[PDB]
Assembly symmetry: D3
């Protein structure tokens, strides 16, 4: 029935899905064990929904395998001492960045920054190398607090509110040479909707930032949003 | 160096809309408008401008694309609605359209337009016969409690997408009679990716009161599986 | 039925279909009302032939919505007083130009020309500002007989017969600075079969005609065929 | 003013035929015919000329593309035809091809050409063995009587497409035998797209006497769904 | 199954299990589809489109698009001698001979291979074709033939030791205007060894050239048509 | 020039490439730093050969990120105490498996096998729990010399010789309920090249092995190769 129900806002779920806990996909319309003597007879598509079906030790990943492939290459090149996500959801990306700099012999500090850090599904006792922080984007004191951080640094942006003042402040009071400011997912959508202003705003950074063309065309998500600092 | 001699804005605002609600025509960059016929074959065969939201009607911007337009023609012609409503307004270009078409078709419709910010609206006052703007939110349902029993048949369109199931719930129990439509543009395919289970339920609780109208349902990218009506 | 039925030269319908009168599409492999408790299991395709579904007030359209949006832009910018369609079929294009100019507030006179106006479907009543004309294109008296038209103006060829002579006449006798001559559909085809002869022809007009590259690439049907007097 | 005194031949004449029935091989424009191997990779990968009707056979043009040819090759092998009829000659390239193949295959097969206009036929007289041309129109069925009952089996091929069903009618009642082919190259899809109802109803008529040969019928773009043959 | 031996399915790579031509068979539908249900009939081919091709009851691994190219090439440059290196069932062999026969070309076909046993050409049908057993690794398999008339086309369908074989040809065989072609494999050699293939290939700039008329005209011959240049 | 040089049989590089050591991509047609005042005018294509540009801590990877996602999910479910790569080339996938089971907290011992181990690239400082063997697949001795190892067990065929015969001995002598046996890459090629046999051979194992549909369709490389043991 409809007349006895109250509905949520499914907008809260965009680019995220329902639940930050991992769901292990199950098959509906086929047996896991397909009989081999009917090999050709078996269906070729997935079996389940390919929305965001990507995990890391039972923790959901918002970055697809290609975006992972990029971040791996980038990490192995820069040996980044600090990696700062800005937008956390379930924390999987944080548990990845840690687990990865670890086997790379990079002693790295991974920092999450979300105003709501309650969706984090990481075990209490898996949090070696990590520092969370609560703070809204429209206030720049949030980011000052972490200025005595080792370099090289990679600032990823995954909320993307007040991003441009965060960039202006970054350049003016944080990024050393060849540190990465990365805007994930949205940059093309800003050029879709607002071409005149975007091309002005980005174009203002002409002399301090620049797109890194090794990584910038190498994944759907990072497409055209990977930046770093120059000498000037 | 233009970075610090500028204050930057929020550009998330323009998502789906574009920076200016007033119509500006396309202009050409890499070609002339007047291609010489001696070199007809040399002519570039691509468009020449942002294919984002080029469309228009009588000098006002239009967000419904030509296919969508088409569908609402066939729809209006078949149904002959005495009322159409547009939750969500922006430049009010689609209101002018709905009004002009019904007029040409001999239909005595009244177009309504419910926004919170009508300031963007662009129609000349002098050209507003059979159009009414109401202000208010999609959160609380009083915005709609003053919508009189206007004439039927009646088409409801959601374009804001906020609390758009509680507004569905109100429309079914208070307003829609047989044959009346209720159309969620744009958003139904994204809600289905981001919540396959929850959406399939919320939507299914209208089993006995609403059916998707296949004739128009799969005939536009914007109206894609977002066209519903009553059969009580 | 093979030893009885006699047949209709089915080439007649090449391009237009069987019935010039509109008939809404009906479903076949479907209910119209798909149940919402099965929303995710409903077909995604259209469910009816997408040949020419398009219409304008019970009249057939053979200008897909995209082409429709082009001429609209064109009509808005130019504000023409005359729009000569050439080839009528059902006259859906006729009524839709007169309707559209009407809302735009423009004093416009639509004129269809065709060797056969017997499939025109326009209601008797809805004929304000539409002047029909009978005559073959391979007769240039079809064109002389025309009284003087007002400007600015657009000339649309959908008959694609003896078209280059008709370009010669129109330039010589009718078209003014800024006026369009628009060949729908056919340009790429001629350029596919006779590329050498097509250029020869098109290129003669280099001093009197240009491709308006603002509209020229904005619709399959108008693909590289929107011309107008640069003068 | 090159237009003032240019004799404008009617361009509709060349529909799917071209300017000239005489074969002339294609010609490079933007690229040297011999490419230097030092710059191998920077050599362009697009054809070079117009893919409109590039094909040929012994200096005669071929309107039947290689996909269509393969089909005819397999059908000639299987059927070992004793007679083959073309309705619509043009340059008669297909006429030569059909005969040259039947000779190689070791098949006594008279080839026959029918056309109201045989002035474009390019087959030299010295190479006319086993090929009989025929002046005549489609409308007039008298034309087909003097097919002096040729030997079977037998492939009828409609390339003219005029009064076609009224030829089919004749052929069935007068010329075809258990296994003989009646084939309509190209049009069948276009008639279905233009006259959906009347075409099914017309094609339905020949149900008892004819079948589509599903082996060949989906086998080339040009022969597509128009390879028919005598059942029972 | 536990006392079974399984063959190397890589022996059948790009060839298939049987060198004989058998004709395709429809499983899921009738050969004779009924005309009342014409619109419901499958649009898809109806069987495996991997090497479905044949010439007079022999399998053809050259597909139609490639045959059209070789025809143009034969017709233009009447060759006195064609050389396949790679034979399989010999359909390319008896094809190359048959075309030359209808063209009035006095042309000798020769096929060379370490394995001929898979050849399906009957003895009655060997006129002007000649088989040879020899290995690529060994260059002395080839000098047997520098008493062969020109013009000459020389196809590589084997892919072993190719670059050494090319250089033997350029030095000891090809006269100006003659063809050496590599079917299928150049584009994979470029994929796999960008730097080494470009080298091995650009060594022959002073003696060979990519024929641009014949090169981009099939899948199989992609960028492998080469010929001898003016000295 | 050519007549001096010796040419490696370029087919040795089929599916692998020239250098087994990793090298990072190098841009040719663009700077690495594109200026922001002309962001919109930058190229959208990659900038290098997408042939096999993937890596893992300085070692090349021939499994693509898709395939690496499937192998993750698999490991995390099975927690294999033994993985067996059959074919090794640069040893990169050998390491990746060892690295990943390690951080998952699994005590898994990775095993590679090859006829040729000289290409392998893994530093000995970083060799923990990786065991190599030399041996042809040809010879069933290669495997009988393999010592007992712990389950659960994934057995990957990445080299594709004698692949079915190996499967037979794997089922008889090595595999156990729940253990895998995955033929990466080749199975879809064997279906096109040899359908009749490929089915008779695969289906001969119907009683013992099954296609794990959860992973067997989630990667173009693993596509329809993922088998697993089941009583
Ligand atoms: C939208 S999610 C990340 C999704 C990711 N961009 C994707 O689609 O792949 C970003 C997180 O940042 C938080 N967030 C949004 N705006 C913020 C702000 N202004 N300051 C701090 N956190 C914010 C949200 O609560 C949310 O959990
Ligand atoms: C997609 S635009 C409207 C499109 C409009 N029908 C047209 O085509 O011209 C979305 C509109 O919804 C309005 N809107 C967004 N959130 C709203 C809310 N919570 N309550 C009422 N209106 C809202 C915005 O002001 C905006 O004008
Ligand atoms: C394609 S239909 C018209 C299309 C329609 N007006 C539109 O806007 O899309 C072409 C029309 O031109 C007519 N026609 C064909 N040949 C003609 C000729 N030689 N002279 C005059 N009219 C001709 C036909 O009778 C037919 O009605
Ligand atoms: C497409 S061409 C022939 C194609 C050629 N047979 C082939 O191999 O594909 C069409 C031919 O039909 C002929 N034709 C057109 N109308 C005809 C008619 N009414 N009666 C007989 N032949 C006609 C034309 O002269 C023209 O040569
Ligand atoms: C692709 S098939 C030949 C294709 C066929 N001739 C055609 O025209 O399409 C490959 C052939 O090359 C032969 N071959 C492979 N390696 C060879 C070598 N090293 N020496 C001689 N022949 C070889 C094989 O015996 C096999 O017959
Ligand atoms: C696709 S690569 C293996 C990639 C491997 N997964 C990795 O990255 O670690 C193929 C390998 O199979 C090996 N190989 C080929 N034939 C073989 C055979 N008959 N016996 C053993 N190894 C063989 C080759 O030497 C080559 O190293």
């Amino acid at each position: 029935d409809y007349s006895r129900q109250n509905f949520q806002d499914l907008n809260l779920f965009r680019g995220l899905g329902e639940d930050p806990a991992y769901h292990p996909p199950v098959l509906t319309d086929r047996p896991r064990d397909w009989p081999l003597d009917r090999w050709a007879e078996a269906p070729r598509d997935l079996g389940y929904s390919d929305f965001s079906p990507y995990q890391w030790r039972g923790l959901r990943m918002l970055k697809d395998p290609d975006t992972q492939a990029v971040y791996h290459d980038m990490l192995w090149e820069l040996r980044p001492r600090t990696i700062v996500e800005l937008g956390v959801y379930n924390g999987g990306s944080l548990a990845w960045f840690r687990d990865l700099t670890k086997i790379m012999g990079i002693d790295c500090q991974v920092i999450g920054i979300d105003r709501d850090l309650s969706r984090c599904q990481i075990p209490a006792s898996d949090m070696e190398n990590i520092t969370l922080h609560q703070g809204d984007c429209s206030d720049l004191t949030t980011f000052e607090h972490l200025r005595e951080m080792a370099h090289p640094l990679i600032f990823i942006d995954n909320a993307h509110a007040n991003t441009f003042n965060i960039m202006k402040w970054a350049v003016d009071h944080l990024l050393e040479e060849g540190d990465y400011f990365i805007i994930e997912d949205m940059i093309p959508y800003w050029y879709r909707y607002a071409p005149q202003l975007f091309s002005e705003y980005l174009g203002a950074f002409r002399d301090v930032l620049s797109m890194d063309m090794l990584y910038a065309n190498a994944s759907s998500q990072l497409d055209r949003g990977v930046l770093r600092r120059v000498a000037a």
